[PDB]
Amino acid sequence: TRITARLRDQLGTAKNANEMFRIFSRFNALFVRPHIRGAIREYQTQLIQRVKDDIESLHDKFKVQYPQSQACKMSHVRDLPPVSGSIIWAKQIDRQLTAYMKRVEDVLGKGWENHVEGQKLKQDGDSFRMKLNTQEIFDDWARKVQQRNLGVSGRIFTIESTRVRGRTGNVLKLKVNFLPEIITLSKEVRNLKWLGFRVPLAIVNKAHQANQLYPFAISLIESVRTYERTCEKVEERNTIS
């Protein structure tokens, strides 16, 4: 009965769903007694409404698409390629949805889903969970990558043209035969394997080889850069030419 008074005391302070769970988390010994469970049943109908708001707010975060979200901007900062970034951003939301559902099982006890309130919230969580599938994103990338057919190939060097200020003719700068997207596939495949998606073995080959070619590729552009950087010294002083 004293705890029942405390059960009045603790909830009146807490308005957020998370807040009630913490104080509720403390009462670990009293889940055996069906006296406090009734006093929990006094509050139960409120807590489904509270966690519904968190899942609503979690859904609101999902309403803003990943590219719009701040996560995409700062994932780009943190050498996280886009397709993996969208997957990771979705995966965390699904986990935090699952985290809220576990609290409900703690709040409402085992067999909570049988509750009329439990059926409704479970239906709401399931629909949001379906929307958070990350297999759909990975599969499209595998198709699109195979359409692109990435491979360095060609030559070790494939020169390209650049317009330089102060020179009327285009200045050809030696470049390692390479494409910017080839960086991403090395990071995408590396990310996806950890995430758990089974990358196609073909794309696996194209990505690691570029990764294994990257040390030699950057080793060569040093020689290009150094040979370049040496040349402007010669351009500076025509005497030593």
Binding site: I159, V171, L172
Partner: peptide
């Protein structure tokens, strides 16, 4: 007087070589 080919002239030579291939 042997002089190193300029970057532009040597690269135009390499352009000519690549283009015909």
């Amino acid at each position: 007087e042997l002089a190193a080919e300029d970057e532009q002239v040597f690269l135009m030579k390499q352009q000519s070589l690549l283009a015909k291939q």
